[model samples]
Target: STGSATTTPIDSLDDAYITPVQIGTPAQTLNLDFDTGSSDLWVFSSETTASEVDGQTIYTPSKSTTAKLLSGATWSISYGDGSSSSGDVYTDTVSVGGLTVTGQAVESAKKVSSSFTEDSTIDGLLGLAFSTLNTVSPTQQKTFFDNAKASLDSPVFTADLGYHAPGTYNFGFIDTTAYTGSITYTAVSTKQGFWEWTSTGYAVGSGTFKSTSIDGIADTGTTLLYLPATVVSAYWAQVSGAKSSSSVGGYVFPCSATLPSFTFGVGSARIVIPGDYIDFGPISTGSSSCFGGIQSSAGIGINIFGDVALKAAFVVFNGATTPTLGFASK
Candidate 1:
């Protein structure tokens, strides 16, 4: 995938986040979500209550003693952003940042009724990306880099995903300024680790809704950007009080509108997505000044670009060379 991401534009959101590490033997850590669309490596414990489950930091592993859980071992997940959690199952000594990783295989949920803490509040998700798109399937998959590449000191794991917005998430360091010397990675034709793509077509106001809008693939574990309802009504018809309310869905303008910008392509790179990221979050549960930009899943059929369109480009997934993905610049 050709690489060239350089988009440094921050407005502060805790610097956009990425921190938390400690694992095993009287120790346990969490905080690692550079997700490449679902690979499991969750955390938050002490049986997790976090003052009513909001999460970030807590891994007792029964206070280590070298940790281990296995027994009946159970695990559950039900996302599409509707959130879900299940528990049981364990094994321990998993570290990051200081790199400790012994045994490592965790899923410990014990039951959680989802919010995922409103998008990253911390204490979970360390899917260093890819293991056949891990949602665990066929022959029972397992990942967290299959246990940080057996105590990683090197076997390659890189992510600096442009930090904060352009792409900030690195794991085994592979920065060639993000691909120029090596690129072209396409594997995973299917699995929970979603790398399958298929949209070289789709448009709203720029016309061309080919087979009636609704584009294709790209979901690094989601963050919102669903379009297809005749292109959100040809893009709120160019907004100004925008319109298209089907019981107050995801698009309405008039929170002061001007709206004009959209792009989504594949097989030659093209990801524009602007309009303040579907009109910047907050304003759900239906209507007020009427806001919630580009949306209309209309029976959902795989049309996601998530992470507000990768915070507008720069997405590298070169898990330490080979099987590459380096789109650098930010």
Candidate 2:
């Protein structure tokens, strides 16, 4: 079986990508963030506290005849950004695009942090990372991708994230026309429960390519690209009037600064991120200072090639017996 869905950025910053998902017998449609950094298919639901529910849509499992409570099953998850949610569990018929799965674990949120409550654009998160990262206790649940992989024509899914336009997510097969060149495959380290891979090197603008191995994870859940302090500093050094500010929480520069493009190596292929993409936008409304799309991962512990980087290339998450990642220019 194969499935395809259109994903669009939820805000002007392209902070998150949301795709519609169908849950239950009557098909309760909810816009969900397809996050590849975590493993928990959680949603805002009727069970959530009324005060915690903002303008976001909620999934009412009771209305779905196909929904069945998972006895004694509960779940809680905390994200890298400090946002958290916990809830009861249910098994329901869930569908994405045209592919359907029966008895899929659907975590209904009982409580949500302010960060999630304020984001009205997304209903919940559908995790695409390895099932090993699932937070459910006693019996870990499989991700939507894992449950569907067995019957899929191919054990793979591809992400085509766009800059300002709508993109696509495809399951079971690769859309050859979506990319411009042959894909470069790299071995993935699933031991960390992430789509972790090592990059050959990186370069700032037209400068020399640094031949170094930088280990990082391809995370769709994160908003910005984070690298080692050395690499981040090297790129920002070229920008005029750039400085790391604690108040802004990252490196910021004059809005008029001429930013340089960033390039990272995947195998032998070099994927370039445009200079414009690096200029994330003004730090605040009408502010003269702008925040950079790339930041230092010094305190983050792990380098994250997030949406800022992923939007620059087509990514393939191959879920075969020996998992591998594929990168290609679009």
The Cα local distance difference test for each model comes to 0.54, 0.94
Tens digit of per-residue lDDT, candidate 2, span 25-97? 8999999999999999999999999999988888999899999999988999999999999998999998998
How far is 108's C-alpha from truth in model 1 (Å)?
A: 13
Per-candidate clashes come to 30, 0
* Candidate 2 wrong stretches, greater than 4 Å: none
Model 1 residue 4 CA deviation in Å? 31
Cα lDDT tens digits for candidate 1, 1-330: 111112222233212334555667766545545455666776667775555366456667777887777776566666665777666656676655455556667766556665654444555665544665444322344675655553444444543333235444344445556444333333333433454444454454465544322334455445566666676676677676776656655565666565666666543445556566566433554434546545776776666656555555555444444444433223
What is residue 252's positional error in candidate 1, in angstroms?
Answer: 4.1
Q: Among these predicted structures, which one has the highest lDDT? A: 2
